[PDB]
Amino acid sequence: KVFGRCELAAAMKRHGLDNYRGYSLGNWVCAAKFESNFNTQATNRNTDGSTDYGILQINSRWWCNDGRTPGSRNLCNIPCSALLSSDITASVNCAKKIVSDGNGMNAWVAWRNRCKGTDVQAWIRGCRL
Ligand SMILES: [Cl-]
Ligand SMILES: [Cl-]
Ligand code: NA
């Protein structure tokens, strides 16, 4: 599923990401934008052999099991395929676990390089939340 900006801002808000652990919702939307271009089925292989899955490109080296990343953990206790669903519950709750790791949203390299320190509020501008 390819979410609309406001539509994802909405679903995220519901699933409780808005200001989750201090990050305004506009950050989560920004991260979604530049990680997956709002698509739930986005996958991208990393050279280390791991793969990033879903709206927030969750990585298999640590967070989900895809059965093809040797010596990786499955901390979110889920099959990486679950992060590819129209339903964003899995990606959310997992992102919650990730962003709590201690390093916050820097865990997302597109967030750090493309959202961090930018006017993120714009991503939720005009949306009926
Ligand atoms: Cl694996
Ligand atoms: Cl933080
Ligand atoms: Na894993």
Domains in the chain, start-ordered, CATH in brackets? Answer: 1-129 (1.10.530.10)
Is 35 considered catalytic here?
Answer: yes
**How does DSSP classify residue 79?**
B
Structure solved via: X-ray
Q: What is the dihedral of CA 103, 70, 110, 101, to 10 degrees?
A: -20
- Sequence-distant (6+) residues with CB within 8 A of 1 are 39, 40, 41, 85, 86
Question: Which structure tokens are listed for 51?
Answer: 């793969």
What is the secondary structure of 12-66 as a DSSP string?
HHHTT-TTBTTB-HHHHHHHHHHHHTTBTT-EEE-TTS-EEETTTTEETTTT-B-
Which residues partner with 65 through β-bridges? 79
Answer positive or negative: Cα dihedral of 79, 81, 83, 87.
negative
- Sequence-distant (6+) residues with CB within 8 A of 102 are none
CA of 5 to the centre of ligand 2 (A): 23
Is 101 labelled as part of a ligand binding site? yes
Is 7 considered catalytic here?
Answer: no
CA of 65 to the centre of ligand 1 (A): 6
Q: How far apart are CA 44 and CA 76, in angstroms?
A: 19
CA of 126 to the centre of ligand 1 (A): 41
Nearest to 84 by CA among 118, 125, 42, 119: 42
Given phi > 0 = left and psi -120 to 50 = alpha, else beta, which region is 104?
left
**Options 18, 48, 52, 87, the catalytic residue:** 52
Q: How far apart are CA 115 and CA 123, in angstroms?
A: 10
Tell me, in Å, the resolution of the deposited structure. 2.0
Nearest to 112 by CA among 32, 39, 31, 21: 31
Q: How far apart are CA 12 and CA 40, in angstroms?
A: 13
